[PDB]
Amino acid sequence: AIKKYKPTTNGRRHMTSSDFAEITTSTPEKSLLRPLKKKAGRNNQGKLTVRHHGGGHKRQYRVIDFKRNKDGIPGRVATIEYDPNRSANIALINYADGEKRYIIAAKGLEVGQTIYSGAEADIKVGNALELKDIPVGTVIHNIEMKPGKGGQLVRSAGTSAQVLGKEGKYVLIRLNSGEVRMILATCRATIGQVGNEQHELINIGKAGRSRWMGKRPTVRGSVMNPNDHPHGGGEGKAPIGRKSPMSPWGKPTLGYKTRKKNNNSDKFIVRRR
């Protein structure tokens, strides 16, 4: 659920958090950990290209199975764990062989169940199927775009997509952002909504807690100097004395569409959000 804190201090007045009730264990699978290093938005050349990054708690990558290409082997759910590298939780799965892999824990997944991948798998939560085998109307996640690559499309916490109809070599799908998109029928997907549905209700409550996740302060352009931002300068507080609000590099920022006007995948999108 969501845990509230009593206002014993001013920095904990409105802070809320998760109770981590669905997490089973606390020790990761040592054979599936890889190191990460913070980049802080720094570039190939050492320059700062993306700002407001860097300086948080150190983490450790643990490899997730997005491909889901182990077919015909029953797999038992062992634990449900915590992954700092993503919003959703993850579930450790040990197949009958003795091979252990991580997946994205869907809603309703619990310890003791069994999941399958392939063409004979049932329409059940956690199973992975090719889109040509999934009946119309079901709720799916972890959609992949190119066959054999791995799931890319719907992966965040508490997100879902729905199959609308099949029309030949392609399949219509309404993505989480609300657009009807057309993708191949040989791609794979996983049935069910993604797990940690309550992630969006959390109140940070502190500036330091925001700093713990690796965020640096954001300075509004209106308090900068004329050579620093198009909004800068002016005696006293000044309004946006321009035709339109501007990004730090020009290029109006309020309503101005930035998608390329000659994109190749324009024909595979039916309607936009």
Partner RNA sequence: GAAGACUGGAGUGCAGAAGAGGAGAGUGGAAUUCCACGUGUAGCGGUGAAAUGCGUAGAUAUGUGGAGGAACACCAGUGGCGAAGGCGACUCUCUGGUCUGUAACUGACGCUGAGGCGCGAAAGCGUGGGGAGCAAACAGGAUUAGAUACCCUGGUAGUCCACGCCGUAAACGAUGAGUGCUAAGUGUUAGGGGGUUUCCGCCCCUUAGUGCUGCAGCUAACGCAUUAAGCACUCCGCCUGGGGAGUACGACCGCAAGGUUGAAACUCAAAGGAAUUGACGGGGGCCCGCACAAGCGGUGGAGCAUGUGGUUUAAUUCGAAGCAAC
Per CB under 7 A, the list member of 63, 136, 207, 223 interacting with RNA is: 136
State the burial class of residue 11 (Cβ atoms within 10 Å of its Cβ: 0-12, 13-18, 19+): middle
Q: Which of 226, 230, 223, 224 has the alpha carbon at shortest distance from 251?
A: 230
Min dist. Cβ of residue 268 to Mg ion (A): 26
Chosen from Mg ion, RNA, none, partner binding at 200 (C-beta under 5 to 8 Å by type): RNA
Question: What are the phi and psi torsion angles at 182 (to 5°)?
Answer: -110, 120
Site string for RNA, 79-118 (x = CB under 7 A): ----------------------------------------
Other C-beta atoms lying within 10 Å of the C-beta of residue 69: 12
Does 141 carry a binding-site annotation?
no
Chosen from Mg ion, RNA, none, partner binding at 94 (C-beta under 5 to 8 Å by type): none
In whole angstroms, give the CA distance from residue 247 to residue 230: 8
The tally of CA atoms less than 13 A away on the side-chain side of residue 200 is: 6
137 sits near RNA (criterion: CB under 7 A): yes
Does 83 carry a binding-site annotation?
yes
Query: Contact at 8 Å (CB) between 80 and 189?
Result: no
Does 247 carry a binding-site annotation?
yes
Q: How many residues bind Mg ion (CB under 5 A)?
A: 5
Tell me if residue 91 falls in helix, strand or coil.
strand
Min dist. Cβ of residue 185 to Mg ion (A): 27
Closer by beta carbon to RNA, 48 or else 136: 136
Which among 59-67, 109-117, 160-168, 258-266 is the span making contact with RNA, rule CB under 7 A? 160-168
Read off the tokens for 82: 């915590």
Query: Contact at 8 Å (CB) between 195 and 109?
Result: yes
In whole angstroms, give the CA distance from residue 228 to residue 67: 45
Per CB under 5 A, the list member of 35, 168, 208, 241 interacting with Mg ion is: 241
Show contacts with RNA in window 38-77 (CB under 7 A): none
Write the DSSP assignment of 54-96 as a string of letters. ------EEE----S----S--EEEEEEE--TTSSS-EEEEEET
Q: How many residues bind RNA (CB under 7 A)?
A: 12
Closer by beta carbon to RNA, 198 or else 210: 198
46 sits near Mg ion (criterion: CB under 5 A): no
State whether the Cα torsion 151-193-111-60 is positive or negative: positive
In whole angstroms, give the CA distance from residue 273 to residue 271: 7
Does 229 carry a binding-site annotation?
no
Closer by beta carbon to RNA, 23 or else 164: 164
165 sits near RNA (criterion: CB under 7 A): yes
Min dist. Cβ of residue 167 to RNA (A): 6
User: For residue 135, what is the DSSP state?
Assistant: P
Closer by beta carbon to RNA, 127 or else 193: 193
Q: Which residues are annotated as a binding site for Mg(2+)?
A: 38, 52, 83, 86, 236, 247
Query: Binding residues for Mg ion, per CB under 5 A?
Result: 52, 234, 236, 238, 241
Query: Binding residues for RNA, per CB under 7 A?
Result: 2, 136-137, 164-165, 167, 172, 180, 198, 200-201, 270
